Amino acid sequence: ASVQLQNVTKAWGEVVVSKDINLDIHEGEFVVFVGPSGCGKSTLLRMIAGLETITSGDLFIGEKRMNDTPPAERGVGMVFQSYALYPHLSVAENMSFGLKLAGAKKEVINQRVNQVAEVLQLAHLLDRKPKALSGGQRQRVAIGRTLVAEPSVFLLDEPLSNLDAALRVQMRIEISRLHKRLGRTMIYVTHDQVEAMTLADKIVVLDAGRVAQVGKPLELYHYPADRFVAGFIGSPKMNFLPVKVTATAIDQVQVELPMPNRQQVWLPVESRDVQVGANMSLGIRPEHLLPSDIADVILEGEVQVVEQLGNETQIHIQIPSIRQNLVYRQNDVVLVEEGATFAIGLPPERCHLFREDGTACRRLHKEPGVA
């Protein structure tokens, strides 16, 4: 079912954790909530589910106002962040509890519990109580209990966080294929970037109780609307360099790099509310920086940290007149020493630009995969 939040506010006395949030979640949409640890993602889920009171504003589920509706009557199932497994019941009993409460046939109960247990790789653990399980197994029991129930609105709170990489990939495929089969509304909370990019129809980025941006995965990646979102979507983080504006066109902004040589570059970025002389923040992603031999704009500094990841090498470079180290991603194993001089390229069209107030100067370079 559809989920709508109109001006939803949540307060714990004086501590406000949701400030006039407006979200429109359509039927069959896969929505992913991301945001820093402590920004109010679970709070929102618990307000939808009816486990938390709504201070002011309106919650709609299936076009119906649900503020004062009891949790059972909301058509909502949740994978709790803390799992909330019934400690006295076995895995099988946990996953089949809701169907037992309802008027479900014993045969249908045993059918879907088995099938869901198979894909979750829990079939050998059916008679176990939660205490005789590992943390990741417990998490999968929590997922399984909701999958078996098949509610109108699925709420998942960081459900893959304690699973190994290989298994995380497998569960991700399962949830996605369940989304296509049933065509139901799913609201998914995660810290994992791969999950968010691959599963979402749409991502909601939350920032200290406010909605920072709502958009398609690639839209947020290529076109973040402010400095917060830019630095939050994509990991390792976007690099940020302080620059000064030297000239503007409607179509572009000329900035001066902070290095002693004061190199100047035209960026295909909007100049709306951009003044000559203003102090801005240039953004450039580690993956988007170029090898020095194929670049016009050259940034040179000293290697501070080298991280060997097998598939790739991440090199942290300290550049004169820039406080924060620049991070650079390189394919394959690259054997660079700490202390070595290292140069990289700064490509104008992949550069982001942020005003003093943090808002993004909208990028005008057309990037593939975005309509």
Partner 1 sequence: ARLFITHLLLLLFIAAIMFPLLMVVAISLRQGNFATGSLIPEQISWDHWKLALGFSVEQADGRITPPPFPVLLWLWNSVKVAGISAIGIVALSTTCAYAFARMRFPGKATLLKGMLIFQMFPAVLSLVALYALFDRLGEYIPFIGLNTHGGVIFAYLGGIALHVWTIKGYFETIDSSLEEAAALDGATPWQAFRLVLLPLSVPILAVVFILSFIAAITEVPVASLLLRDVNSYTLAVGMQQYLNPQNYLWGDFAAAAVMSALPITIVFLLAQRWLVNGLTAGGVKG
Partner 2 sequence: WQSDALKWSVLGLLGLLVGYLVVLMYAQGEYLFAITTLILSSAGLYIFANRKAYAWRYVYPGMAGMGLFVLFPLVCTIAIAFTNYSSTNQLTFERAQEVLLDRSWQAGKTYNFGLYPAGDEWQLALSDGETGKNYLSDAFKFGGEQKLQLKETTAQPEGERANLRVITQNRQALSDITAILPDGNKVMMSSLRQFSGTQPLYTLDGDGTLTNNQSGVKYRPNNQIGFYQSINWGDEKLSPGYTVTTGWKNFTRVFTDEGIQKPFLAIFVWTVVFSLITVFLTVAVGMVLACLVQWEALRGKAVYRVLLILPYAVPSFISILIFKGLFNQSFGEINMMLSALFGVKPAWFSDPTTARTMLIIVNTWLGYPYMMILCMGLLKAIPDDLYEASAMDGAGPFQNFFKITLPLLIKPLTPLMIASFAFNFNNFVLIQLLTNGGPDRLGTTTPAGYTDLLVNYTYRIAFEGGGGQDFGLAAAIATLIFLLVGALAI
Ligand X SMILES: Nc1ncnc2c1ncn2[C@@H]1O[C@H](COP(=O)(O)OP(=O)(O)NP(=O)(O)O)[C@@H](O)[C@H]1O
In whole angstroms, what is the distance from residue 17 CA to residue 40 CA? 6
Residues 36/190, Cβ–Cβ less than 8 Å: no
Q: Which of residues 8-37 bind ligand X (CB under 6 A)?
A: 12, 15, 17, 35, 37
Site of interaction with partner 2 (CB under 8 A) = 49-51, 70-72, 76-78, 80, 82, 84-86, 88, 97-98, 101-103, 145-146, 149, 151
Q: Which is nearer to partner 2, 76 or 91 (CB)?
A: 76
Task: Provide, rounded to whole angstroms, the least separation between the CB of residue 100 and partner 2.
Answer: 8
Paired tokens of 219: 């839209």
DSSP H or E segment with residue 243 = strand 239-248
| Window of 103-111, 158-166, 264-272, 354-362 that interacts with a second copy by CB under 8 A | 158-166
Q: Which is nearer to ligand X, 33 or 240 (CB)?
A: 33
Residue 40 site contact among ligand X, partner 2, Mg ion, none (CB < 5 to 8 Å, cut-off depends on kind): ligand X
- Chain centroid offset of residue 203 CA: 7
In whole angstroms, what is the distance from residue 265 CA to residue 248 CA? 11
User: Is 277 one of the annotated binding-site residues?
Assistant: no
Q: Which of 187, 168, 285 is nearest to 233 (CA)?
A: 285
Q: Which of residues 142-201 bind ligand X (CB under 6 A)?
A: 162
Beta-carbon count within 10 A of 186 CB? 23
Q: How many residues bind partner 1 (CB under 8 A)?
A: 30
244 binds a second copy (CB under 8 A): no
Task: Provide, rounded to whole angstroms, the least separation between the CB of residue 200 and partner 2.
Answer: 23
User: Of the candidates 53, 127, 135, 292, which one interacts with ligand X according to CB under 6 A?
Assistant: 135
In whole angstroms, what is the distance from residue 58 CA to residue 4 CA? 8
223 binds a second copy (CB under 8 A): no
Paired tokens of 329: 């991603």
Residues 268/252, Cβ–Cβ less than 8 Å: yes
In whole angstroms, what is the distance from residue 360 CA to residue 95 CA? 46
Cα radius of gyration rounded to whole Å, the chain: 24
User: Is 39 one of the annotated binding-site residues?
Assistant: yes
Site of interaction with Mg ion (CB under 5 A) = 42, 81, 134-135
237 binds a second copy (CB under 8 A): yes
- Environment class of residue 126 by beta-carbon count within 10 Å: exposed (0-12), middle (13-18) or buried (19+)? middle
In whole angstroms, what is the distance from residue 140 CA to residue 193 CA? 20
Tell how many helices (H) and how many strands (E) occur in the chain: 9, 20
Q: Which is nearer to ligand X, 163 or 360 (CB)?
A: 163
Residue 368 site contact among partner 2, partner 1, a second copy, none (CB < 5 to 8 Å, cut-off depends on kind): a second copy
Site string for partner 1, 139-178 (x = CB under 8 A): ------x---x-----------------------------
Place of tokens 């640890």: 37
User: Is 361 one of the annotated binding-site residues?
Assistant: no
In whole angstroms, what is the distance from residue 211 CA to residue 6 CA? 12
Q: Which of residues 82-141 bind partner 1 (CB under 8 A)?
A: 82-88, 97-98, 101-102, 129-133, 135, 138
Q: Which is nearer to partner 2, 55 or 193 (CB)?
A: 55
Task: Provide, rounded to whole angstroms, the least separation between the CB of residue 237 and a second copy.
Answer: 6
Residue 353 sits at φ, ψ, to 5 deg, of -140, 130
In whole angstroms, what is the distance from residue 25 CA to residue 211 CA? 14
191 binds a second copy (CB under 8 A): yes
Interacting residue ranges for a second copy, rule: CB under 8 A: 12, 34-38, 42, 81-82, 132-137, 140, 157-158, 161-169, 191-194, 197-198, 217-218, 221-222, 231-237, 285, 287, 307-312, 329, 331-335, 367-369
User: Annotated binding site for ATP, which residues?
Assistant: 35-42
